[PDB]
Amino acid sequence: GPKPKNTKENLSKSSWRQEWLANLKLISVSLVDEFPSELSDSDRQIINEKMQLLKDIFANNLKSAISNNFRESDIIILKGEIEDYPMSSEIKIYYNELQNKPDAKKARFWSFMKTQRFVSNMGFDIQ
Ligand SMILES: [Br-]
Numbered sequence: 001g002p003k004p005k006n007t008k009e010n011l012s013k014s015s016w017r018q019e020w021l022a023n024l025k026l027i028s029v030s031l032v033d034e035f036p037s038e039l040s041d042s043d044r045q046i047i048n049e050k051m052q053l054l055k056d057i058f059a060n061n062l063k064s065a066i067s068n069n070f071r072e073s074d075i076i077i078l079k080g081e082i083e084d085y086p087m088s089s090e091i092k093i094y095y096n097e098l099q100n101k102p103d104a105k106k107a108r109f110w111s112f113m114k115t116q117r118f119v120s121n122m123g124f125d126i127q
């Protein structure tokens with residue numbers, strides 16, 4: 001059927017989308033398994049299901065590589081916000097190793113909530 005084509009998209013937004021679509025095919029993404037803090041079993045299952053959906057979109061629609069080693073990934077998707085992770089967590093230790101790297105190439109850390117909004121804005125029907 002007819003493909004959606006937003007004739008009202010301005011150049012800012014269409015350029016943002018174009019550059020993201022191109023860049024996403026070049027990177028490695030990690031959907032990190034570690035939770036920042038304790039949560040009840042049923043609440044962890046809800047998060048895991050959301051992480052799996054994001055994984056499928058990144059791998060299959062956005063064409064990113066998916067890794068189990070977050071130290072090789074360009075976008076690191078977390079099961080909470082970075083401030084939720086304790087200093088003892090390697091996610092926080094690595095984040096701290098990168099914080100003062102003035103290196104535009106360094107990894108970015110996104111909660112699953114932040115990631116879901118990004119994917120929605122890229123045109124996918126997600127929660
Ligand atoms: Br802490």
Ligand SMILES: [Cl-]
Pocket residue numbers: 114117
């Ligand atoms: Cl944001």
